Design a protein around this ligand. Structure first.
Ligand SMILES: CN1CCC(c2ccc(-c3ccc4c(c3)C(=O)N([C@@H](C(=O)Nc3nccs3)c3cc(F)ccc3O)C4)cc2)CC1
Ligand SMILES: CN1CCC(c2ccc(-c3ccc4c(c3)C(=O)N([C@@H](C(=O)Nc3nccs3)c3cc(F)ccc3O)C4)cc2)CC1
Ligand SMILES: */C=C\C(=O)Nc1cc(Nc2nccc(-c3cn(C)c4ccccc34)n2)c(OC)cc1N(C)CCN(C)C
Ligand SMILES: */C=C\C(=O)Nc1cc(Nc2nccc(-c3cn(C)c4ccccc34)n2)c(OC)cc1N(C)CCN(C)C
Lengths: 288, 287
C-alpha cells in the first residue's frame, strides 16, 4: 500500500525547466539522481504544515495507488515548506496542446481511440469509486501518440466543464464526470477550442438551464454528437455510463471514416505495427 | 515477423555522442525523431553491399524476434551508405564497467541475482536455439542496477571461449555455459581481466594442461564448484542453463552464506518502495 509512494529528499532531485502550472502549484521538468550512480532520470514535479501533510499524504497514497494503463500514478512526494509531488514525465505533453499543434495531421482513427482510452481510464476511476472532478483535455497526457493517460484527478473554477448539478450544488459524481467527459471529447473533435468562449462563467448555468449546449463540431457526424449531447442531459442518471461509452467509441473506432469526417483523412492513418512496436520498446513498456 | 524490425531513414535519427566500440562497429548514443513530431527519443546506434545486406537482414529479423526480460531485442536498422542498427539505450552502461565502478557498494545479493538473470536470458536463447558465442560481462547491459539484459548475441574473445571453440571453432550452447562461467568470475572479481598478462596464443595450452581461473577470495567453495563445472573439458558434462538458474537462485535466498564480502550487511537490495520507483521511471516491462 504505502510502499507505492517514495519519500524523496530535496537533495535527490532538481527542477530544471518549467512546463506550466495548474490545480495546486507549478509543474516543472526535472531529473531524478539515484543515490550512488550518475544517471539523470527525467520526471515531472508539481510544487504546491506538518498536520496538513497528513491530509496531503493520506490523499497522496490514494493517487499513488492506481494501476491502469490509462490512469497516471503518483510516484513520489517531498515534504518541504512547500510540498513537491513527482510523477513520470510524458514527453508528448498533454492532449490539449497536442491536438492544437497537429490539428492538420490528426486522422479520425487516433481521435476515436483517444476517446476510448479516456473512457477506459474514467471507467477505472469509477470502479475505484474515485471521482475525477476536473476531467478536461488539459488533464489527459500523452505517453505515446497511441497511448494517453488521465491525470490530476481526485482533488477536492472549471465551470465550462461542469455538469449543471456541480455548478448549482457542487455535486460531483461519476455521472457528473461523464458530463465533463462530454466536454473533453468536444475539445478533441474541435482541435482544442475553448468551450463557451466569451460567455461569462457566471452566466453558463443560466444558459445550460435554458437548454443551450456546445455546438456540433464540424468533423462530427450526428452519431458522435448525439453521444456528446446525452452526456449533457440535466438528469445525471440519464447520461451514459463510462462502461457504455467505451463500447460505443470502440464500435466507432472499427469504422472511423463513417463517424468523423476530416479533410485528408485517407492520407493519415495509424502507425503500422512496426511503428507501434518501435514506439513501445523505446517509450511504452507497460501492459497496454 | 518482419514487423518486429523497423526500417529507418538516416533523416529520422542522429548519432550524438560516442559511447564505445568493440564487437562489430562503433556504438553511439542517439536520438530518434518521430516523423511529424517534435519529441527527441534517446536510442543506441551501432554504425558498422546490397547483397551482403540480405545476409544482414536475415539475421536482423532473428535478433528482432526475441521476447524475454533478460535478452535485448534489436529494434531497427537503417541500411544506407553505412549499416546502422538501433536498440534501446541502457543508461547504466554495461555490467563490466558497472562492477568496476561500483565495487565499493556491490553486495552479495546483487552479484548472485545477476547470475540468476544471466542464466535466465541464456536459457531462453537456448530454447530459441540461438548460440550466443560471445557471452561476457561486457555484453551484459544494465537497464537498472536490479535488471540486466544480454546483448550482441547470434553474431576473437579467446579468454572467454570454451576449449573446443579455441581448438575447433565449435560453438554450441554448452560452449556458452563456459563463457557463462567466465562471466561469473569477472563479476565475482569485481571486474578483473581473465588470464591477465598471458598472451592469447597460449590460453589453449594452459586449458588443455588443466589449469583454470583461480577461486576469487569473496567466493565460497560452493560457488567455485559451479564455475569449475562450467569449465570441464567434456561439453556435455558442463551444467545446463536451466540448472544454473535453480542453483544461483537457491544461493540468493541466503546470500552471505555463499559470498564473503567485507561490509556486506550494510548493502542490501532496494526496498520494494525503491523497486517500484525504479520500475515506473526506467523499467516498466514484465520482469
Ligand atoms: C483544501 N484544503 C487545502 C490544503 C490541504 C491539501 C490536501 C491535499 C493535497 C493533494 C494531495 C495529493 C495530490 C494533490 C494534492 C495533487 O495535485 N495531485 C496530482 C499531482 O501531483 N500531479 C503532478 N504533476 C507533476 C508532478 S505531480 C495527481 C497526480 C497523479 F499521478 C494522480 C492523481 C493526482 O491528483 C495529487 C493538497 C493540499 C487540504 C485541504
Ligand atoms: C563477413 N561479411 C562482412 C559484413 C556483412 C554483415 C553481416 C551482419 C551484420 C549485423 C546484423 C545485425 C546486428 C549486428 C550485425 C550487430 O552487431 N547487432 C547488435 C546491435 O545492434 N548492437 C547495438 N548497440 C547500439 C545500437 S545497435 C545486436 C543488438 C540487439 F539488440 C540484439 C542482438 C544483436 O546482435 C545486430 C553486419 C554485417 C556480412 C558478411
Ligand atoms: C495541457 C497542459 C500540459 O500538461 N502541457 C505539457 C505537459 C508535459 N508533461 C507532463 N508530464 C507530467 C505532468 C504534467 C503536468 C501536470 N499539470 C497539472 C501540468 C500543468 C502544466 C504543464 C504540465 C503539467 N505534464 C509536457 O512535457 C514536455 C509539456 C507540455 N507543454 C506545455 C507542451 C510542450 N511540447 C514540448 C509538448
Ligand atoms: C561497456 C560499455 C558501454 O556499453 N557503456 C555505456 C552504454 C550505454 N548504453 C548502451 N545501450 C545499448 C547498447 C549499448 C552497448 C552494447 N555494446 C556491445 C556496446 C559497446 C560499446 C558501447 C555501447 C554498447 N550501450 C550508455 O548509455 C548512456 C552509456 C555507457 N557509458 C559511457 C558508461 C560510462 N558512464 C555511464 C559512467
Amino acid at each position: 500500500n504505502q510502499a507505492l509512494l517514495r519519500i524523496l529528499k530535496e537533495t535527490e532531485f532538481k527542477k530544471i525547466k518549467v512546463l506550466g502550472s495548474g490545480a495546486f502549484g507549478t509543474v516543472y521538468k526535472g531529473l531524478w539522481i539515484p543515490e550512488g550512480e550518475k544517471v539523470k532520470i527525467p520526471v515531472a514535479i508539481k510544487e504546491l504544515s506538518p498536520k496538513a501533510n497528513k491530509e496531503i499524504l493520506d490523499e497522496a497514497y490514494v493517487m499513488a495507488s492506481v494501476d491502469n494503463p490509462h490512469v497516471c500514478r503518483l510516484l513520489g512526494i517531498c515534504l518541504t515548506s512547500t510540498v513537491q509531488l513527482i510523477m513520470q514525465l510524458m514527453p508528448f505533453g498533454c492532449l490539449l496542446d497536442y491536438v492544437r499543434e497537429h490539428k492538420d495531421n490528426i486522422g479520425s482513427q487516433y481521435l476515436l481511440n483517444w476517446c476510448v482510452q479516456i473512457a477506459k481510464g474514467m471507467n477505472y476511476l469509477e470502479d475505484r469509486r474515485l471521482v475525477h472532478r476536473d476531467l478536461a483535455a488539459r488533464n489527459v497526457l500523452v505517453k505515446t501518440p497511441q497511448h494517453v493517460k488521465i491525470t490530476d484527478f481526485g482533488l477536492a473554477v472549471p465551470i465550462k466543464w461542469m455538469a449543471l448539478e456541480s455548478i448549482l450544488h457542487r455535486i460531483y459524481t461519476h455521472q457528473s464526470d461523464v458530463w465533463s467527459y462530454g466536454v473533453t471529447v468536444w475539445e478533441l473533435m474541435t482541435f482544442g477550442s475553448k468551450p463557451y468562449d466569451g460567455i461569462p462563467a457566471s452566466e453558463i448555468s443560466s444558459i445550460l438551464e435554458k437548454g443551450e449546449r456546445l455546438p456540433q463540431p464540424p468533423i462530427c457526424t450526428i452519431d458522435v454528437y448525439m453521444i456528446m449531447r446525452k452526456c449533457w442531459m440535466i438528469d445525471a442518471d440519464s447520461r451514459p455510463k463510462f462502461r457504455e461509452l467505451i463500447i460505443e467509441f470502440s464500435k466507432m473506432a472499427r469504422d472511423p471514416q463513417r463517424y468523423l469526417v476530416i479533410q485528408g483523412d485517407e492520407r493519415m492513418h495509424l502507425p503500422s505495427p512496426t511503428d507501434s512496436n518501435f514506439y513501445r520498446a523505446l517509450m511504452d513498456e507497460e501492459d497496454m
